[PDB]
CSV table of C-alpha atoms and ligand atoms in Angstrom, one decimal:
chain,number,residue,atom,x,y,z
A,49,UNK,CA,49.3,45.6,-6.5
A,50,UNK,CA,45.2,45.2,-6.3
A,51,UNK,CA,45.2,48.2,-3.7
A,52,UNK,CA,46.7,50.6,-6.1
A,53,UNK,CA,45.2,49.6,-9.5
A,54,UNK,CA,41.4,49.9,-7.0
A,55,UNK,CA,43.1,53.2,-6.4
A,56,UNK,CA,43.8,54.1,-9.7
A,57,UNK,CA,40.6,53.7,-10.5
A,58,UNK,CA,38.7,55.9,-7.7
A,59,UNK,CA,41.1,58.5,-8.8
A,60,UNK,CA,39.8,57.7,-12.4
A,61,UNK,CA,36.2,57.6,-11.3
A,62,UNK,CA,36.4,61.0,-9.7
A,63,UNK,CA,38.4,62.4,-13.1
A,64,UNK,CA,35.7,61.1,-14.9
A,65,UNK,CA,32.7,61.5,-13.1
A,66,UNK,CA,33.4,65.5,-13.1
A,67,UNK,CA,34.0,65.4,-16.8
A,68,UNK,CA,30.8,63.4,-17.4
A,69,UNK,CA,28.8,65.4,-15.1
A,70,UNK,CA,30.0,68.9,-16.4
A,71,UNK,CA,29.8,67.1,-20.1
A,72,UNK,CA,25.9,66.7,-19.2
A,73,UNK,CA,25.3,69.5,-17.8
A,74,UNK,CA,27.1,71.4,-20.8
A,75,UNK,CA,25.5,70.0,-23.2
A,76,UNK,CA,22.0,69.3,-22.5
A,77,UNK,CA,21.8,69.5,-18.8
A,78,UNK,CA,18.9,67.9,-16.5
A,79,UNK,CA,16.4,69.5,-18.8
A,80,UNK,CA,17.5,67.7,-21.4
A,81,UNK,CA,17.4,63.9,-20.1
A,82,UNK,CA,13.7,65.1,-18.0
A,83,UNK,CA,13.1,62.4,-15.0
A,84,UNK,CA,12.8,59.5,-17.4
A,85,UNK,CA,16.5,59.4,-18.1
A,86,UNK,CA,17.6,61.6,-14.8
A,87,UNK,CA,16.8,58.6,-12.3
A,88,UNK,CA,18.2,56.2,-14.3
A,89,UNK,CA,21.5,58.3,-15.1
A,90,UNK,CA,22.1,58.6,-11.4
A,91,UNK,CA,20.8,55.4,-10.1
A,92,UNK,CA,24.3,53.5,-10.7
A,93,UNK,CA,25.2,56.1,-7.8
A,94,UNK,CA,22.5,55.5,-5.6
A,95,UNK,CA,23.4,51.4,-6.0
A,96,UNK,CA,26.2,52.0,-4.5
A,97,UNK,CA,25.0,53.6,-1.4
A,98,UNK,CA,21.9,51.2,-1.2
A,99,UNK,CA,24.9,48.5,-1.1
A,100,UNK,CA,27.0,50.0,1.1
A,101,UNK,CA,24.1,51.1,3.5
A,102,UNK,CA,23.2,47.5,3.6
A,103,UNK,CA,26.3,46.1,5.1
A,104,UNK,CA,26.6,48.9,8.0
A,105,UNK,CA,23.8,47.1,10.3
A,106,UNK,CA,26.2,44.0,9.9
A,107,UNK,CA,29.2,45.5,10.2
A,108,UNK,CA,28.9,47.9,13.1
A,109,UNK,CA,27.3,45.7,15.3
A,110,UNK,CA,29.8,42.3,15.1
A,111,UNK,CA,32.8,44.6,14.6
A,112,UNK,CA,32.0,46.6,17.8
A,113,UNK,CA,30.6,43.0,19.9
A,114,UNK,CA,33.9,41.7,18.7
A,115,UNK,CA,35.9,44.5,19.3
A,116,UNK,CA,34.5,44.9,22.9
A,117,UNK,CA,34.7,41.4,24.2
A,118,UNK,CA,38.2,41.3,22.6
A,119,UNK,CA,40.0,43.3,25.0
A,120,UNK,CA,39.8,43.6,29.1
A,121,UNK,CA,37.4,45.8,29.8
A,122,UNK,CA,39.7,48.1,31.6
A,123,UNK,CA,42.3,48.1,28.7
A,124,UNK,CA,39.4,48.7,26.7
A,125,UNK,CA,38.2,51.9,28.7
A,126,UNK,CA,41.6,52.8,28.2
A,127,UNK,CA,41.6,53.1,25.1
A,128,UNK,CA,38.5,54.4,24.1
A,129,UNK,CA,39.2,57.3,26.6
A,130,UNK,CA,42.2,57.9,24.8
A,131,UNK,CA,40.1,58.1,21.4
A,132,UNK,CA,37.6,60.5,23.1
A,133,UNK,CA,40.6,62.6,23.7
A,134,UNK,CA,41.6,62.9,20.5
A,135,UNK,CA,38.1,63.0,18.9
A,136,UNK,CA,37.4,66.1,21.5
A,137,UNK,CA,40.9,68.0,20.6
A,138,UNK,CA,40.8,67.6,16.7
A,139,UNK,CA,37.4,68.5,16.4
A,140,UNK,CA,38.5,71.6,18.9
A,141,UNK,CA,41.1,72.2,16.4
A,142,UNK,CA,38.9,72.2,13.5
A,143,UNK,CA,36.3,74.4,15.3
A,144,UNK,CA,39.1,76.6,16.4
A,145,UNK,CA,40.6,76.5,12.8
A,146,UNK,CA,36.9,77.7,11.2
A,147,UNK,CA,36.6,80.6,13.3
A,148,UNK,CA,40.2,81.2,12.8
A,149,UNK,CA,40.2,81.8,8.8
A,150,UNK,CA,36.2,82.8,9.0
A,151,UNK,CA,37.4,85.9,11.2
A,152,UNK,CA,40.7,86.3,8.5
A,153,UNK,CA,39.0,86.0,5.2
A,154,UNK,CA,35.7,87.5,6.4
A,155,UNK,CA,33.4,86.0,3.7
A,156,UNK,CA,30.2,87.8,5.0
A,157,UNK,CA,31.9,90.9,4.1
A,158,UNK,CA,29.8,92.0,1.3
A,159,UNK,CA,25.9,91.9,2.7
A,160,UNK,CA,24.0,91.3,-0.3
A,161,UNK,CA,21.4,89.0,0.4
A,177,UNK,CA,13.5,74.3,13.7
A,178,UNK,CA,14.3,71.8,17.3
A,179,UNK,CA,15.5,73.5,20.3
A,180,UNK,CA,19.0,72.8,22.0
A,181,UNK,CA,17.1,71.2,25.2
A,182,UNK,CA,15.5,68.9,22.7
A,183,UNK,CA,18.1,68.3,20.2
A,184,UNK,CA,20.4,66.8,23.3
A,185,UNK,CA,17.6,65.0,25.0
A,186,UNK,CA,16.9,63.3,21.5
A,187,UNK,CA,20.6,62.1,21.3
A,188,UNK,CA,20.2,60.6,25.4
A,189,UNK,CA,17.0,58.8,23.6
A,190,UNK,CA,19.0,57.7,20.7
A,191,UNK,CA,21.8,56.5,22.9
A,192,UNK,CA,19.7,54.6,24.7
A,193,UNK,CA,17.1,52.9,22.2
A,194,UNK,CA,13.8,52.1,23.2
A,195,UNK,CA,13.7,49.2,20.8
A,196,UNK,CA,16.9,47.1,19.4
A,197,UNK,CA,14.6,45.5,16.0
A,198,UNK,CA,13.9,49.8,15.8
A,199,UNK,CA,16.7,51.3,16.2
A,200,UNK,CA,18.0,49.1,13.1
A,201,UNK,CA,16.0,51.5,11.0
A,202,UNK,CA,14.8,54.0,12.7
A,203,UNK,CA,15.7,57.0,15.1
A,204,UNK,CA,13.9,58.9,17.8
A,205,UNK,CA,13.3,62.6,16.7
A,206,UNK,CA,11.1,65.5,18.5
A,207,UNK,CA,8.4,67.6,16.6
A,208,UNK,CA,6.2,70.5,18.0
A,209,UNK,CA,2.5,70.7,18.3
A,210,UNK,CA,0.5,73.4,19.7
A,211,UNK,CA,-1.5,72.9,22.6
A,217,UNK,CA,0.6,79.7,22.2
A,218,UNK,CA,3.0,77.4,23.9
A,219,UNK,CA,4.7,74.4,22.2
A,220,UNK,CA,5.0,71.1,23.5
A,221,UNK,CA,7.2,68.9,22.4
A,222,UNK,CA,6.2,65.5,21.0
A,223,UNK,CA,8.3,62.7,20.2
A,224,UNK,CA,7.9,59.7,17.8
A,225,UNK,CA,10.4,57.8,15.6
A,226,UNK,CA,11.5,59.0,12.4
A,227,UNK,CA,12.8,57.0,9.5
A,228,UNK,CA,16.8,56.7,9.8
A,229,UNK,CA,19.2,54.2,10.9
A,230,UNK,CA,20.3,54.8,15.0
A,231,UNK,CA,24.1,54.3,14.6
A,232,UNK,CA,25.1,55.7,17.7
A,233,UNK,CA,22.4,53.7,19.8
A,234,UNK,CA,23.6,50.4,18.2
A,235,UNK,CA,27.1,51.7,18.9
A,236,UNK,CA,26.5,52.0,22.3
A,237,UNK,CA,24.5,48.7,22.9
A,238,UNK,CA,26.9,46.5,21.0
A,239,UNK,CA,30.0,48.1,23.0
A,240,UNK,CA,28.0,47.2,26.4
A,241,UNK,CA,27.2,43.8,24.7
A,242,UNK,CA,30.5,43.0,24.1
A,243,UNK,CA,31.4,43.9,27.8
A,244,UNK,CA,29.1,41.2,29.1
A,245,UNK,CA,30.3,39.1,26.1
A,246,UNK,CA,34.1,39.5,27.8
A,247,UNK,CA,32.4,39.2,31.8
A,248,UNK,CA,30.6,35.9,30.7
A,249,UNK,CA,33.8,34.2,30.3
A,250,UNK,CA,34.0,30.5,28.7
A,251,UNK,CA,30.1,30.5,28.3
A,252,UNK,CA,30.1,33.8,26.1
A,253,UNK,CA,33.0,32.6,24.1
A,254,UNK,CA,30.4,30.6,21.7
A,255,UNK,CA,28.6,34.2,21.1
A,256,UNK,CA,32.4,35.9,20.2
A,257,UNK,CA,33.2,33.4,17.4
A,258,UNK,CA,29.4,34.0,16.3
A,259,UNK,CA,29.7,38.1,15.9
A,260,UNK,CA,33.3,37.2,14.4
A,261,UNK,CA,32.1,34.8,12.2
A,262,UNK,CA,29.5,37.5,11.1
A,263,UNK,CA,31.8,40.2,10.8
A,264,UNK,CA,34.3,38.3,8.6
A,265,UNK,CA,31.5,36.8,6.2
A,266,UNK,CA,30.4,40.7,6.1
A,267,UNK,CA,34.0,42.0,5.5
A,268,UNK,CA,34.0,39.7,1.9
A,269,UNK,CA,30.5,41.5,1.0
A,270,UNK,CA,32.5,44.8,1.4
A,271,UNK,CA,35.5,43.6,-0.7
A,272,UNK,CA,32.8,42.9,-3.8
A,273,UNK,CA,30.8,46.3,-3.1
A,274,UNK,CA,34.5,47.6,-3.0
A,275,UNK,CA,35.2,47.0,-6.6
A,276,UNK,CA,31.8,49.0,-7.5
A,277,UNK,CA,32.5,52.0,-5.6
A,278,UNK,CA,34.6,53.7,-8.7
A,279,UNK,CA,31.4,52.8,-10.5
A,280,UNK,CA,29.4,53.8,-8.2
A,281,UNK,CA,31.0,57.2,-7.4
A,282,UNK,CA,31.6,58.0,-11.2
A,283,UNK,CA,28.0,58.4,-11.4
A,284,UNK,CA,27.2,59.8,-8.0
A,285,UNK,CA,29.1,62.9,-8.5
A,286,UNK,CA,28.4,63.0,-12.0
A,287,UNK,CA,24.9,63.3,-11.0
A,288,UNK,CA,25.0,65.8,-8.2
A,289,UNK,CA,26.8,68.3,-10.4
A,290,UNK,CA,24.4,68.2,-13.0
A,291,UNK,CA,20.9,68.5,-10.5
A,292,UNK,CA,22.6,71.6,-9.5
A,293,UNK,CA,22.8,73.2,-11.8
A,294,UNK,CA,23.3,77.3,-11.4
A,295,UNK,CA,26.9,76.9,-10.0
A,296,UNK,CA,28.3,79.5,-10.8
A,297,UNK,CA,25.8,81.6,-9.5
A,298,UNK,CA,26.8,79.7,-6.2
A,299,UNK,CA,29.9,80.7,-6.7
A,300,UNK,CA,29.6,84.6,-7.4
A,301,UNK,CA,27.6,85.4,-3.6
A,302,UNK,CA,29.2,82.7,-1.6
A,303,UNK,CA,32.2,82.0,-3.1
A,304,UNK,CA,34.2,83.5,0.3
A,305,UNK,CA,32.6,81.3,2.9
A,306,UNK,CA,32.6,78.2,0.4
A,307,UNK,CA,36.3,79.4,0.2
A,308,UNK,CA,36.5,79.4,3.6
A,309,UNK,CA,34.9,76.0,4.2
A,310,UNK,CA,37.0,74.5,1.9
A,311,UNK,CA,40.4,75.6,2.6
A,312,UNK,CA,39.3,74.8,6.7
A,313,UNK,CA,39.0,71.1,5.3
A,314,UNK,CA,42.0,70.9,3.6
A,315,UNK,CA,43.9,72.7,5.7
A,316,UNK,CA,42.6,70.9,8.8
A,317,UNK,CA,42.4,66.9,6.4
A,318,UNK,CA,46.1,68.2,4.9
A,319,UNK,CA,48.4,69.8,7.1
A,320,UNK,CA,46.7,69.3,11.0
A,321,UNK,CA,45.3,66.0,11.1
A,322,UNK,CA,48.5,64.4,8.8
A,323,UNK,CA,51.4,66.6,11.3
A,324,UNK,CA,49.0,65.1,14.3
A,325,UNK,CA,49.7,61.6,12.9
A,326,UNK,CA,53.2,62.2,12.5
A,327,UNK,CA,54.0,63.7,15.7
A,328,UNK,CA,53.0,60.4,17.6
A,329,UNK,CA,53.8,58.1,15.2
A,330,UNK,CA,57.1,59.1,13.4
A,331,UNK,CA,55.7,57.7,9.9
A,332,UNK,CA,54.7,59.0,6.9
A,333,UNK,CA,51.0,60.2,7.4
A,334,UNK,CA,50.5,61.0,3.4
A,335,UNK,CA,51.3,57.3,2.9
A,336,UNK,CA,48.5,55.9,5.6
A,337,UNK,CA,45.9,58.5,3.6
A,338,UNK,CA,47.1,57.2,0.2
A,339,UNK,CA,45.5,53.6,1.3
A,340,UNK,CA,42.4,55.2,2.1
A,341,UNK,CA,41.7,56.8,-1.3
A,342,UNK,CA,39.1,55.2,-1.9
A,343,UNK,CA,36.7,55.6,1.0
A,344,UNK,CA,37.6,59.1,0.9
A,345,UNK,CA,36.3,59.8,-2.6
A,346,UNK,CA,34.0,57.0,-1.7
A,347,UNK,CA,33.1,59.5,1.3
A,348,UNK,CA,33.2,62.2,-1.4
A,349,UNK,CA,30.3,61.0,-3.5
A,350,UNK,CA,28.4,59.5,-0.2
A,351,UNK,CA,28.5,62.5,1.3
A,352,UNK,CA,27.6,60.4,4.4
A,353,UNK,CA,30.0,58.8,6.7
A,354,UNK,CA,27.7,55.8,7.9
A,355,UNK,CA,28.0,54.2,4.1
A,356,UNK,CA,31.4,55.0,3.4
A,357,UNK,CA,32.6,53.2,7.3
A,358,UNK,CA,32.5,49.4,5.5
A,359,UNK,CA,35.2,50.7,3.2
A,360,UNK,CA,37.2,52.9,5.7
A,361,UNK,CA,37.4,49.5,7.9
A,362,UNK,CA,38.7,48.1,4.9
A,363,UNK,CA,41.5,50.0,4.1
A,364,UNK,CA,42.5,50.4,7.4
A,365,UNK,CA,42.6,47.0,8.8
A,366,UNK,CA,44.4,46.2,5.0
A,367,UNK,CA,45.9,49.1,3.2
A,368,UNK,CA,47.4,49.8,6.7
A,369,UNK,CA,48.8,48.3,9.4
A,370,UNK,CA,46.5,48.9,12.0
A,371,UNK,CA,44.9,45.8,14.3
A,372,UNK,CA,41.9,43.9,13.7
A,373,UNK,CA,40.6,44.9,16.8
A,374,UNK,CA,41.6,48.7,17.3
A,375,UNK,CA,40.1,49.5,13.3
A,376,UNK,CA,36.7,47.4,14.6
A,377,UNK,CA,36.3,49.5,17.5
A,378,UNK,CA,37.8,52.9,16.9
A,379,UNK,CA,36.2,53.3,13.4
A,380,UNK,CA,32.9,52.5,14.0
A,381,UNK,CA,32.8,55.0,17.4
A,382,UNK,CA,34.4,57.8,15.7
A,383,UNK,CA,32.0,57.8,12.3
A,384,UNK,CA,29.1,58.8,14.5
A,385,UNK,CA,31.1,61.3,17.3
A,386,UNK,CA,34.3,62.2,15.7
A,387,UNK,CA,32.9,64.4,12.8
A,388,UNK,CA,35.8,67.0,12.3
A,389,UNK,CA,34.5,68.5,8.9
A,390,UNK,CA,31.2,69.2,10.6
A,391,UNK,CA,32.4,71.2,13.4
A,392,UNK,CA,35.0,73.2,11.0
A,393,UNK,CA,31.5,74.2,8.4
A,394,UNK,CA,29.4,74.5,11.4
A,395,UNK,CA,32.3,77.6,13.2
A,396,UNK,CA,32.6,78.9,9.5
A,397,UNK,CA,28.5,79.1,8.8
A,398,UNK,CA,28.8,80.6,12.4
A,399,UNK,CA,31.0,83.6,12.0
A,400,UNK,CA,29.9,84.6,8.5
A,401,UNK,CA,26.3,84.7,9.8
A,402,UNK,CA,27.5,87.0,12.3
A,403,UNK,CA,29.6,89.1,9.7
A,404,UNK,CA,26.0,89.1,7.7
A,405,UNK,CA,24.2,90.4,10.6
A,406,UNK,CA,27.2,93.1,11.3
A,407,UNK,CA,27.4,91.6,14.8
A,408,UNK,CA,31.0,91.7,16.1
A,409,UNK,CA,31.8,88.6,18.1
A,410,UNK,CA,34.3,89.1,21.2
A,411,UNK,CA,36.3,86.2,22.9
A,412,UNK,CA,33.3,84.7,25.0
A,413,UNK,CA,31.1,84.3,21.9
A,414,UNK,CA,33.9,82.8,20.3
A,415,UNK,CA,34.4,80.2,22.7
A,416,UNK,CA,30.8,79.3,23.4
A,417,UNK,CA,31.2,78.9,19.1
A,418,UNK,CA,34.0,76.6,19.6
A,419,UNK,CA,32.1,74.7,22.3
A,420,UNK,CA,29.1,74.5,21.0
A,421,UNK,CA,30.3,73.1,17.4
A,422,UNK,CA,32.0,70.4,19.4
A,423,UNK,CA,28.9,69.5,21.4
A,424,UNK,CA,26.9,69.7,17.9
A,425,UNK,CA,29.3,67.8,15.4
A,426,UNK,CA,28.6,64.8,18.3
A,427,UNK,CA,25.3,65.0,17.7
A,428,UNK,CA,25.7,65.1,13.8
A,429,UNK,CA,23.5,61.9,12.4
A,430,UNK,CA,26.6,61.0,9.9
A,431,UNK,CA,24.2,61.4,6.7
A,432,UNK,CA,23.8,63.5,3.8
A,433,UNK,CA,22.7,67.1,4.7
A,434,UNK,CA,23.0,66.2,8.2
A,435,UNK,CA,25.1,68.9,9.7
A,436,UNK,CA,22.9,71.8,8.8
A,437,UNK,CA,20.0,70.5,11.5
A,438,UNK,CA,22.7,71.6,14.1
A,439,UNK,CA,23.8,74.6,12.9
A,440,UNK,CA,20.4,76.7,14.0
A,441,UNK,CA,21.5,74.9,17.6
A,442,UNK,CA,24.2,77.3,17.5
A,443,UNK,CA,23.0,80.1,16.2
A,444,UNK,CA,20.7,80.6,18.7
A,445,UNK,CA,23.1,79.8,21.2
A,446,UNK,CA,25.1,82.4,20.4
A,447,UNK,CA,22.2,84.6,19.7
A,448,UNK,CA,22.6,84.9,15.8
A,449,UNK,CA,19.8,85.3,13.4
A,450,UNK,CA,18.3,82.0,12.1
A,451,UNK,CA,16.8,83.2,8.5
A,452,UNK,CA,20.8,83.4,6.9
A,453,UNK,CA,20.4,79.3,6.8
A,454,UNK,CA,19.1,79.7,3.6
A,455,UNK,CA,21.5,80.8,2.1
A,456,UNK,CA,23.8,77.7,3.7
A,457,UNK,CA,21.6,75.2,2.1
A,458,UNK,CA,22.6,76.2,-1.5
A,459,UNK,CA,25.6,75.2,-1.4
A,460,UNK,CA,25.3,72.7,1.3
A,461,UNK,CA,25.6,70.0,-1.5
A,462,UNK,CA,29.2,70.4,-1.9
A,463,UNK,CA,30.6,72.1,1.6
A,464,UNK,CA,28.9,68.7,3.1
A,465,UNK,CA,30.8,66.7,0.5
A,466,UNK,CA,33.7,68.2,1.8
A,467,UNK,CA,33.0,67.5,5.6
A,468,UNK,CA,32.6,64.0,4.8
A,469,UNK,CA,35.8,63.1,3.8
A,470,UNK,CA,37.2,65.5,6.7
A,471,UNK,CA,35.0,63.8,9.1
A,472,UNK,CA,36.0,60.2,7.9
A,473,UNK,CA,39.7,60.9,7.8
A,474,UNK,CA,39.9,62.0,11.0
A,475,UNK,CA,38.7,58.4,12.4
A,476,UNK,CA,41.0,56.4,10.1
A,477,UNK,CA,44.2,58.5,11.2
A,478,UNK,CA,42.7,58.1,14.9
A,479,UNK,CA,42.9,54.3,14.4
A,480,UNK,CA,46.4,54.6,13.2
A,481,UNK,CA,47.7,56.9,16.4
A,482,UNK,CA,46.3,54.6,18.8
A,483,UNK,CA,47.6,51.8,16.8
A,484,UNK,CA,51.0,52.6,18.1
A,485,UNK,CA,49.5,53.2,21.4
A,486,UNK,CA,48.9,49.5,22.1
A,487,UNK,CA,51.9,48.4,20.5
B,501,LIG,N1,28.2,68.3,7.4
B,501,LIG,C1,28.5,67.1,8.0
B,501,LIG,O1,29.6,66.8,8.4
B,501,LIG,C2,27.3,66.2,8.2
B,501,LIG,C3,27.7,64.7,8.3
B,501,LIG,C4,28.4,64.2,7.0
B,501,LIG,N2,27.4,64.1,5.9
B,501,LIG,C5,29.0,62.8,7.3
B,501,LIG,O2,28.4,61.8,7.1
B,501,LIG,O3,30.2,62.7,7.7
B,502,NA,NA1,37.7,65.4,16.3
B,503,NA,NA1,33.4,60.5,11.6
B,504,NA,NA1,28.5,63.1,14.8
């Protein structure tokens, strides 16, 4: 079968872009190749998420016109109330399931070492709701702070695709697409026509994702360098981020699955191997969605039109790994700080993770911008942050494929829904 020797390969690529990178590193290490050769050693990397960040303008906005204007609009409320259900409990459980081994493990045991929340939500109404469609394509509004000792916020548009506004346009789109009737019918077979010319694009970039990823993480590991370092002074909370990740992408989110849908939920992950690793070495869940589509609508058994709509939502609101680092960074702060957190504080941690992980952007390093949201929420110090971002390469590694995984078994459990 093509799907598993494309597996075999990821699962190759992986194998063997840790044993080049550590080979590198070992050796010579980034010292050794200079900038010359360390840009061109990890470019085959970032080809592959140039490519695959290419395709998601295409892709998420014919998949979700289609997707919208394919179903009745209240069958299609329907369901995507029934995916905001489970986005909302899932990334509960994985909030829930950070505190939970955060509190058990303790990893700040052993004490040895921004944008406001009024702003930070008001920036996700405005990206919603983009000023500009031609804009939001490549850009997303963000709030900075200039003094005029009081601060006032200004607002101006930062470099960075704005998934979630062209989510929500092309969903309202494909509404008045379906409302038209016969005279929108011409603009349905146009966004299909679109998104299945886009879907062969992926299937080639598909077969250059083991390249690709061979030499994405074989890269990362050998820029940072000093891991074991890492690994000596926050070994417990990566530990704890980790374990939350497999636990919650192993045991939770496959017995979910299986609960609804009496099938094997190990087998519907084994057709996704690939944009899960591909999710790995992205480290962002907007590049690895063209792939995730892919399997899913393929690999598995789930619709055309329930993998169009319920993929593209959920990788820009159903971010499970996010919420699960974001409790985790939470509590061991507060272990840092010797602050002992009662049942209220542990809610508002649970709640305000959820509220956060929406607002998560879906790119590398992205989940750290609102973990100082709730910190200060929960009234923790802000300065411990620091010590996140040193490991932050790999913890957001793991959130991705958490975060990813989530939204493929989602469109699998409401599969069975319609059917
Ligand atoms: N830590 C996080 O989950 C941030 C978002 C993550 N990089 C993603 O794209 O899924
Ligand atoms: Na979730
Ligand atoms: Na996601
Ligand atoms: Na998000």
């Amino acid at each position: 079968l093509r799907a598993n020797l494309l597996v075999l390969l990821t699962v190759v690529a992986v194998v063997a872009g840790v044993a080049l990178g550590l080979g590198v590193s070992g050796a010579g290490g980034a010292l050794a190749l200079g900038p010359e050769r360390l840009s061109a050693f990890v470019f085959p990397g970032e080809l592959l998420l140039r490519l695959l960040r290419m395709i998601i303008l295409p892709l998420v906005v014919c998949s979700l016109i289609g997707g919208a204007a394919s179903l009745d609009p209240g069958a299609l409320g329907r369901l995507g109330a029934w995916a905001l259900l489970f986005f909302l409990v899932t990334t509960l459980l994985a909030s829930a399931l950070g505190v939970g081994l955060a509190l058990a493990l303790q990893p700040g045991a052993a004490s040895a070492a921004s944008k406001e929340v009024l702003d930070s939500f008001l920036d996700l109404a405005r990206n919603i709701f983009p000023s500009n469609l031609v804009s939001a394509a490549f850009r997303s509004y963000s709030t900075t702070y200039e003094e005029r000792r009081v601060k006032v916020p200004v607002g101006q548009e930062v470099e960075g695709m704005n998934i979630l506004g062209l989510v929500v346009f092309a969903i309202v789109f494909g509404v008045a697409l379906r409302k038209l009737g016969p005279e929108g019918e011409l603009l349905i077979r146009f966004f299909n026509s679109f998104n299945e010319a886009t879907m062969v694009l992926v299937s080639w970039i598909m077969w250059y994702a083991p390249v690709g990823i061979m030499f994405l993480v074989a890269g990362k590991i050998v820029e940072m360098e000093d891991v074991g370092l890492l690994f000596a002074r926050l070994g417990k909370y990566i530990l704890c981020c980790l374990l939350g990740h497999a636990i919650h992408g192993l045991l939770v989110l496959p017995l979910i699955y299986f609960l609804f849908t009496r099938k094997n939920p190990y087998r519907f992950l084994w057709g996704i191997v690939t944009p899960l690793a591909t999710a790995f070495g992205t480290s962002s869940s907007s590049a690895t969605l063209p792939l995730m589509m892919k399997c899913v609508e393929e690999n598995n058994g789930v619709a055309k039109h329930i993998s169009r709509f319920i993929l593209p939502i959920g990788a820009t609101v159903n971010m499970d790994g996010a919420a699960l680092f974001q409790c985790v960074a939470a509590v061991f702060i507060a272990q840092l700080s010797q602050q002992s957190l009662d049942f209220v504080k542990i809610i508002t941690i649970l709640v305000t993770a959820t509220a956060s992980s929406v607002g998560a952007a879906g790119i590398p390093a992205g989940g750290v911008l609102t973990l100082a949201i709730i910190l200060e929420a929960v009234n923790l110090p802000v300065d411990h942050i620091s010590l996140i971002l040193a490991v932050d390469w790999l913890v957001d590694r793991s959130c991705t494929v958490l975060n990813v995984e989530g939204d493929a078994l989602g469109a699998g459990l409401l599969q069975n829904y319609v059917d």
